[PDB]
Design a protein around this ligand. Structure first.
Ligand SMILES: O=C(O)c1cncc(-c2ccccc2)c1
Length: 167
């Protein structure tokens, strides 16, 4: 049994809710919240900007030190950093950004990072300002992630379309 409330069950392991991921993280304090990260961990917009704002920029400060030591992530890669006031840990995952011309096949690689964590609160990778089709992102999620994932979708309209169209 876990804390997550109000989710629709899509599969054995994937759940979905119309929710503001910062507000959900603040309520649940999950072990892992996933950030929609980029290679230089610059949390300025989309999910990264909202999560970082909710940490009063502490996520960005920590991330800048991580990059100064380790260099950029790979597209499709991830790192584990603090969850600050939102979660125990933040899994920063880099989905491909279609608005930069990145290969959408890297979306499956991105989702594979979730399998290293038994339970996660996450957004749909590569959705929003990353430019991918969220319907496609949900399909890759269901077909790739085997651990228990609780998806928060910001737009009510999009949430209803994702559920109605789910095979
Ligand atoms: O649900 C998403 O895929 C999503 C994409 N871009 C931004 C957001 C967002 C926007 C404001 C607050 C918290 C999350 C969610």
């Amino acid at each position: 049994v876990n804390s997550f409330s109000g989710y629709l069950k899509l599969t054995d392991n994937v759940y979905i809710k119309n929710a503001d991921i910062v507000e959900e993280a603040k309520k649940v304090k999950p072990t892992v919240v996933v950030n929609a990260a980029n290679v230089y961990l610059k949390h300025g917009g989309g999910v990264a900007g909202a999560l970082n704002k909710a940490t009063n920029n502490a996520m960005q400060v920590e991330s800048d030190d991580y990059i100064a030591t380790n260099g950029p992530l790979k597209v499709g890669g991830s790192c584990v950093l603090s969850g600050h006031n939102l979660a125990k840990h933040c899994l920063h995952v880099v989905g491909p950004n279609v608005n930069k011309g990145e290969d959408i096949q890297l979306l499956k690689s991105a989702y594979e990072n979730f399998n290293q964590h038994e339970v996660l609160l996450a957004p749909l990778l590569s959705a929003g300002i990353f430019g991918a089709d969220p319907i496609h992102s949900l399909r890759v999620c269901v077909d790739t992630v085997r651990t228990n994932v609780y998806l928060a979708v910001f737009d009510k309209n999009l949430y209803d379309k994702l559920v109605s169209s789910f095979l």
